[PDB]
Amino acid sequence: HMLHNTFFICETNQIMNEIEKAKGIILNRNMNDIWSALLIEVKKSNLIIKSTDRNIFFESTISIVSETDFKVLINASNFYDAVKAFNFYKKIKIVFNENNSKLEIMGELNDEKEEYEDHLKEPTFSYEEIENYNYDMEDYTFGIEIKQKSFKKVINRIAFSAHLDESKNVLNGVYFSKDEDSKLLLVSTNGHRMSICKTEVIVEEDVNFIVPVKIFNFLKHLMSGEGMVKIKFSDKKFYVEFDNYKIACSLINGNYPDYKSIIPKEQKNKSLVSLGILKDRLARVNLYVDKSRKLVLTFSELQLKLLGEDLITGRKGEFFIKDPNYLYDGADEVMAINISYFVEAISVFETSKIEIQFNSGNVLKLSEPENFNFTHLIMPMSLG
């Protein structure tokens, strides 16, 4: 590889955005760590950017100008800093100096370079380290293509409910299944709160897959919301492709719990609450809830009472929501609920009002009026 012909020219803002995206899954330990690096490949007039956390494998492509093909492994954080450092150039020229294990970066100006021009030198890994990192983008058992906008909404309603500990293997995954009508269905839970999203997609094949939630948190940052996204499953892997991206990860090989059994059939007590006012009041009563997150709710016909109380000190805040912001049909019911779960759940709702229904001493069910595709359940806390 020679300096004069081992380079590429790219749009600075574009490669900045793609590096920011790719490094999203990279835990940036130390500049000498190959797992803190990303792999860029020049292939004719395309640049391929790859990153991995050794479970999720990510690949993006952008158009460039080049003369020879080559690969470079470079610390993601430093490379991002370099491109940010040069964001005042519309285009940059990136030169690979294999003799010194360095990327030399200069603005790709439109005409002559002077003696003294701005210049960056970014050290790279050796060519022998690329073999340790590289991944090449299996027999698919089932695939669907859906609108990006819909998939983003489903992710927004599903991802937050999965268990947050990646070592609690099953509950940290998003469960893909099929309902009685053969419609694709997503479920997530941490054991205490749960999201269920039924789609309109009909799938003839068997669907029984558990996908670690991290890829969905990643995806919601990547998807524009315009266009289509192809999703594919194999025996061991999950695959997603859309726009200039390809992403894959491993499935969790386990048995997802029988979520169907905890869905309440008919609930005796039903409330309809104005969403914006609920959000505002929860933010205020939150100032009176301790680290246990225990919020005490009282449902009556005329009002919903929100009580934040500290039993040790006597510090207490009480807020009421009444007509025209609250309707209730049921018995007088007092219950404790995790305010973080409550707030997190209602923050994904987009309707003017929210339905909150429950059987006494049982799971609280949250839903949108006229939406029969989305259900969120929250187990109450012991009142005492």
């Binding site: 839970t189 054991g191 719990p257 979520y259 109450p380």
Partner: peptide
Amino acid sequence: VPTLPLVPXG
């Protein structure tokens, strides 16, 4: 802090 009626799990 009881869990959901999940089998198994709670």
